[PDB]
């Protein structure tokens, strides 16, 4: 794994990408790591925001599946041509696999100017692949064609340069401290988990736990924010407001439309509360909690000022534990054991007084009832 450490790069707020190669001879591309979808896709035609792109005609091993595909996301969408080719990860396992590849030929609000990635690696399950579950996702193909164990882990390191590690096939202990706590994957489609309690600076939000998972809760490396179901978002904002008493912020700030700025070096983190999500544990009536700091949910936007955007936002399609959550943690996607592990990240941003945390056990009854049905 030492050869996989620090294999992720990016621009703050623009996405974490791994270098991959496709075709013959190898065409090097930067690919966004996305646990929130299941399609492997690459820019395959010129676009204002692409420095490079997949040239199918230059790959001797490219196969045209002669079928189109369309993939819509919460933010953006693209359409393209299905096909297959040979795929390797330079700073990952030493192997070449054949995999499905969507060559993106049309897109809207998908590519991000200056982000330095040209494609996306959907790491979730076949069930949500487009056009349908018969289009084998990359990680399934990797596992089937090699001896790479059915597991990967992500360490996303926040901030304007960003970095981290995608450890393919294992867990690198130098990337975390303390204990790993596991939560079951409720269902193999997205990486769906179950949130059983929410606290803001130790104050219970006091909602029925089903609200926290309406209509699902997912772990998504390809989404910036912590996105909460509308009802939960409103309650969270009210509680966060109350907690941050010494300062009043405009409505626009809480909607992510206005930045808050302070003299460089004087950000009063102490004003804002920590936020804890309790997750269903692997043992009956047992939960654990992960706690994030405002250094996670107030994201720096790029003079002599530090400006931040509030990065907790509303969702119409359930909770999304995005980069805001993941940057505090080393996260183990244990597909073999149908579970997601969390530990305190060795690289998370914090201060001399508070730290991101993973702690348990806590007693929580009837946790299974916290799941929403359908």
């Amino acid at each position: 794994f030492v050869e996989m450490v620090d294999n992720l790069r990016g621009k703050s707020g623009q996405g974490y990408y791994v270098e991959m190669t496709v075709g013959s001879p190898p065409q090097t591309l930067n690919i966004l790591v996305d646990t929130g979808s299941s399609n492997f896709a690459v820019g395959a035609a010129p676009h204002p925001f692409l420095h490079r792109y997949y040239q199918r005609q230059l790959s001797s091993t490219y196969r045209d599946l002669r079928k189109g595909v369309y993939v819509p996301y919460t933010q953006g969408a693209w359409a393209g041509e299905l096909g297959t080719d040979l795929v390797s990860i330079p700073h990952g396992p030493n192997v070449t696999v054949r995999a499905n590849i969507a060559a993106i030929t049309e897109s809207d609000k998908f590519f991000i100017n200056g982000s330095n990635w040209e494609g996306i690696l959907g790491l979730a399950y076949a069930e949500i692949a487009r056009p349908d579950d018969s289009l084998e996702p990359f990680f399934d193909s990797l596992v089937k064609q090699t001896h790479v164990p059915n597991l990967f882990s992500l360490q996303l390191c926040g901030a304007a340069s960003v970095g981290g590690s995608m450890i393919i096939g294992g867990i690198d202990h130098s990337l975390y401290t303390g204990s790993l706590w596991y939560t079951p994957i409720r269902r193999e489609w997205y990486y769906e988990v179950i949130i059983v309690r929410v606290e803001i600076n130790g104050q219970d939000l006091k909602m029925d736990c089903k609200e926290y998972n309406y209509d699902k809760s997912i772990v998504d490396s390809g989404t910036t924010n912590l996105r909460l179901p509308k009802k939960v978002f409103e309650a969270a904002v009210k509680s966060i407001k109350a907690a941050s008493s010494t300062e009043k912020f405009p409505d626009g700030f809480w909607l992510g439309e206005q930045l808050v700025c302070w003299q460089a070096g004087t950000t009063p983190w102490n004003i804002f509360p920590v936020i804890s999500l309790y997750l269903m544990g692997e043992v009956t009536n047992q939960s654990f909690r992960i706690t994030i700091l405002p250094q996670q949910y107030l994201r720096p936007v790029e003079s002599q000022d530090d400006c931040y955007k509030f990065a907790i936002s509303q969702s119409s399609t359930g909770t999304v534990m995005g980069a805001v959550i993941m940057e505090g943690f080393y996260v183990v996607f244990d597909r073999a054991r149908k579970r997601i592990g969390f530990a305190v990240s060795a690289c998370h941003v914090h201060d001399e007084f508070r730290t991101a945390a993973v702690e348990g056990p806590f007693v929580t009854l009837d946790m299974e009832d916290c799941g929403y049905n359908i």
Partner: peptide
């Protein structure tokens, strides 16, 4: 990143 399901 998927919308729909």
């Amino acid at each position: 990143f998927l919308a729909x399901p």
